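Can you give me the bound-state structure? Components:
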Amino acid sequence: GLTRYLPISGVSSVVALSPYVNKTITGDCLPILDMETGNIGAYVVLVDQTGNMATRLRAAVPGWSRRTLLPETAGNHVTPPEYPWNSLWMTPVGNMLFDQGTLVGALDFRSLRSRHPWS
Amino acid sequence: GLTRYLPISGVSSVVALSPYVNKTITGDCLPILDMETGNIGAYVVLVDQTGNMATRLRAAVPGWSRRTLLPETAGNHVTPPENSLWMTPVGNMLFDQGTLVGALDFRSLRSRHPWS
Amino acid sequence: GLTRYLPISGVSSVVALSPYVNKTITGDCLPILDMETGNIGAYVVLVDQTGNMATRLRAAVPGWSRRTLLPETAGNHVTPPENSLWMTPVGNMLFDQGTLVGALDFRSLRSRHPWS
Amino acid sequence: GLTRYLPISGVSSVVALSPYVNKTITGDCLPILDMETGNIGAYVVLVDQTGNMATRLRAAVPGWSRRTLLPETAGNHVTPPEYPWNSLWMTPVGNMLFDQGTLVGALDFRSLRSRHPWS
Ligand SMILES: [Cl-]
Ligand SMILES: [Cl-]
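Here's the bound-state model for the whole set.
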């Protein structure tokens, strides 16, 4: 398969390892800490208020609802593939398998019809 | 305690739920997907090549090293408060309810970010 | 759907929430711990050395291979219903709400267990 | 460090890779499927009805409450280590760290004061 996905604890979400290089983006930023160094090599950037991460954050941080300037929806998406059975299905990207624990998708994410802030 | 942290599978990295509102940054973007929908409301922005996220990406996508324009290091980091393997960059943290909670508000620590 | 499945970190293995009540088995026991308490109410029982759990254990505990008395294989397995990389041993499964749910009741499939 | 721990999806629980060899044990058994083969190389065995796994199972399987013969508590445990600060703490076993994503404990589990069905 191609694209790999990293589950995030405490939310029904995954980091898709399909990079879009050298883009600029605006929103509410959550630091990602490297635990062994304390370096911050990456940030989670929320661009609207609907999603599992938004829900979790509202619960973790009750002022954020009132402080944020984000839209409720900003429009970004991937178009979920059509159904084919006997498969392992993840709605936004389709067929999956487990490889020594890691989530691997059959398709490359970059190749589904998606829209992001830089489009 | 005052700050919650979500571990990311496959890396020694946590999402600090300590918002910095309406900032702009540049880097390599990874969609965060929800299992239930194609709607995307968040991305991971990598800002250097030495972070654990960068490192996991290279293993997964061998060609990304050639295309990225990120520096090896950006001076973004968090400093803990006033043997070393077992310490944390933010101070005391505890596993609870599927996540981690720490004893301090992240915002109270010394932290440098791209908007500094 | 009728059966829920919990992935186990680091292995291509799932816990089928399809109980078989009051059975007795023999094998190598691993405590399952809750983050909030020292109370233990469940264990993983390995029953062979070729399962993914066995394999992860060897990497973590090099001396356990010499001490275990388990066979290489026990004929416990599940058969799916009436290209091959993308299939599942139980049929259709979907990611939902942090776990997996399948379209069948596990108990309805052909399965051999130590109590067979 | 020594003992390694495997988070289980959907519950605040972990498999402790500290084996107790060739023991016999009774209870309600959940198969553990190898996804790439369909082999069942291991079973989860519940020995009482209190715990995060019991809770999740009650929600997944509402007949189980009425069908099970387990006690509410069977007594098994590990004695949580005493507190020392700046550490990463997991109540039942103490100091932890992350190693390329994996949970590693400072102690060997087998060396805390614990009790199990075979004791
Ligand atoms: Cl990889
Ligand atoms: Cl290991």
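A couple of observations. The radius of gyration of chain D is 16 Å. The first strand of chain D starts at residue 4 and ends at 8.
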